């Protein structure tokens with residue numbers, strides 16, 4: 001309803017919807033009139049024959065609503081499939097230095113291409129975790145930044161520690177895996193014979209649960225000591241970095 | 248276009264559609280609270296600290312609360328700029344090592360044993376396949392304390408596979424609002440750190456040498472961590488094949 005989150009750019013990849021199971025033909029415009037109620041729409045693409053297309057709505061909010069309202073809707077004789085398109089150009093930035101803001105991160109990565117958003121991630125106290133996100137409008141810009149940031153040392157502040165840039169690992173902690181989408185085969189039925197429950201001493205489960213809990217503890221040991229060598233090696237190198245810059 | 252649009256799988260009046268309001272004038276009233284937020288539909292519990300100058304109000308959907316939050320933030324009221332925000336969830340848990348064929352519903356049924364579950368989701372990757380991690384948010388922190396304690400002392404099994412889930416406090420990260428420039432104290436130290444714009448270290452320069460050492464250190468970390476990850480993977484898949492054999496040696 002005119003709603004734009006402060007900072008949000010419009011018609012970014014994050015408000016772009018995939019539309020699947022379309023009926024044969026469907027003019028571009030028809031596609032548009034389905035999404036009429038959900039605001040203006042930029043790019044529209046329908047595929048010749050394979051019955052899918054993309055629509056780019058204005059704000060992410062507008063697209064969420066349109067997503068859950070139109071997902072599965074029948075038209076002629078088939079269920080629409082409507083999901084947020086996979087982002088083609090989102091990057092994880094690691095080891096951000098201190099005094100970096102969303103806007104600095106954006107400015108820095110602007111030299112690689114047009115930036116849809118950049119966010120310095122903060123924990124529940126508001127302190128930056130050291131990771132960021134950078135989403136470009138096009139795959140070419142993220143390829144530039146990926147490549148140039150591995151070959152060279154990209155420095156955001158005077159602190160001589162370069163950020164590490166890798167592709168963003170896109171996880172969905174919102175829709176998840178509805179019971180409707182679980183593969184229901186023989187293994188499914190085997191998993192589901194018993195309901196959730198606590199393993200009881202003397203059962204065959206209990207013996208293996210304890211072995212697993214022990215293994216998880218053997219992983220805590222190993223991993224807690226790597227963390228050891230790692231927090232040491234970094235602190236060593238960061239002192240020398242800070243001392244060096246004393247000039 | 249309807250107000251009560253609810254993301255599928257979303258209950259009403261959860262912690263996730265509760266907004267906090269700070270910087271209130273001393274003569275704020277509950278009726279004023281509800282009036283500020285009418286428009287954003289039905290309102291549930293409304294609390295107002297009698298004098299710490301904050302309060303909070305349960306809206307019905309996360310969607311309405313996101314619109315209220317943008318519209319009401321920094322609104323002046325009788326001399327004060329209102330600060331409107333989401334709080335971090337008080338009862339939000341991470342579940343590790345999900346067995347296969349687990350759904351959001353199963354995950355929620357399972358954890359509803361410990362208290363009222365607001366939301367449960369099996370995290371799915373970008374090709375739709377379960378990551379093995381999950382989220383469970385309870386309506387109140389004492390439910391999540393119970394789940395933590397009981398899943399730690401005992402072995403909680405969601406299916407027939409004899410692998411208990413690990414349950415720990417979820418690490419709430421904000422990858423949406425982030426760290427906006429306006430929040431940053433722009434003093435002497437800020438400006439010294441910003442002296443050099445973003446740039447690539449050029450060879451023959453005091454940064455260049457140290458950036459390289461860091462890149463080497465990153466590489467060394469990665470290699471070390473890959474050695475652990477592979478050892479872990481081999482050991483997990485050995486015990487997991489034993490578990491599977493043992494579950495067939497029942498069926």
Ligand SMILES: *CC(=O)N1CCN(S(=O)(=O)c2ccc(OC)cc2)[C@@H](C(=O)NCc2ccc(OC)cc2)C1
Pocket residue numbers: 124334335336337338339388391392395416417419
């Ligand atoms: C807003 C938020 O998510 N918080 C508030 C602070 N806590 S905490 O880590 O300070 C903490 C408070 C209470 C507590 O036990 C009752 C344990 C820790 C946060 C947090 O992570 N809360 C989730 C949580 C943590 C532990 C337990 O049981 C021991 C339950 C729930 C972050």
